[PDB]
Amino acid sequence: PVASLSMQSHFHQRLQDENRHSAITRFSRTTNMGVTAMTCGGAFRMLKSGAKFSSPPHHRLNNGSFLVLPNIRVCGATALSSPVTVGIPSLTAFFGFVHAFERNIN
RNA sequence: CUGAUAACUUCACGGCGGGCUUGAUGUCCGCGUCUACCUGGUGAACUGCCGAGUAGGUAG
């Protein structure tokens, strides 16, 4: 996977109004990454939820082969997953976790 | 088979000095709670003697 400066400009420009979703990520240092980084040197704003966690109900009620795994705690994960969003990780990370688990246990 | 594998940010740090919130103030008038009403001991711990003795000891 690689990055598109065109998608970076699309996801860049609109959020200047909405600073509630601003996540300033200054990069390598603006010498050799490219002039598209020199254009917005310092800001590099990206997408985040704009609100913290909350309190849900897990369930209101009370195939098969349901294998139950509680209380997985992940410290030091990856939040900058896409080039443009900042928040929860990828779903291909969870897919790779599950596929590595079955390729162990088979 | 996880934008793959690896990845010690840290050391020091005196927000202090001063300060009159007060003046005045009629809440009141009126007011019928009433009618009715079975808690029961089945028969169920007796008859005597001594003690001057509502106290006190006896025999069965």
- Measured CA to C1', what is the nucleotide nearest A81? B3
Assigned token pair, A37: 């980084």
Beta-bridged to residue A86, according to DSSP, are A80
- Measured CA to C1', what is the nucleotide nearest A94? B2
d(CA A22, C1' B14) / Å: 38
Assigned token pair, A52: 């913290």
d(CA A99, C1' B24) / Å: 86
Phi, psi of A7 (to 5 degrees): -60, -35
Q: Kindly report the three-state secondary structure assignment for every residue of chain A.
A: CCCCHHHHHHHHHHHHCCHHHCCCCCCCCCCCCCHHHHHCCCCCCCECCCCCCCCCCCCCCCCCCCCCCCCCCCCCCCCECCCCEECCCCHHHHHHHHHHHHHHHC
**Is strand B within 7 Å of residue A2 (CB)?**
yes
- Measured CA to C1', what is the nucleotide nearest A2? B3
Q: Locate tokens 């800001």: which residue? A: A43
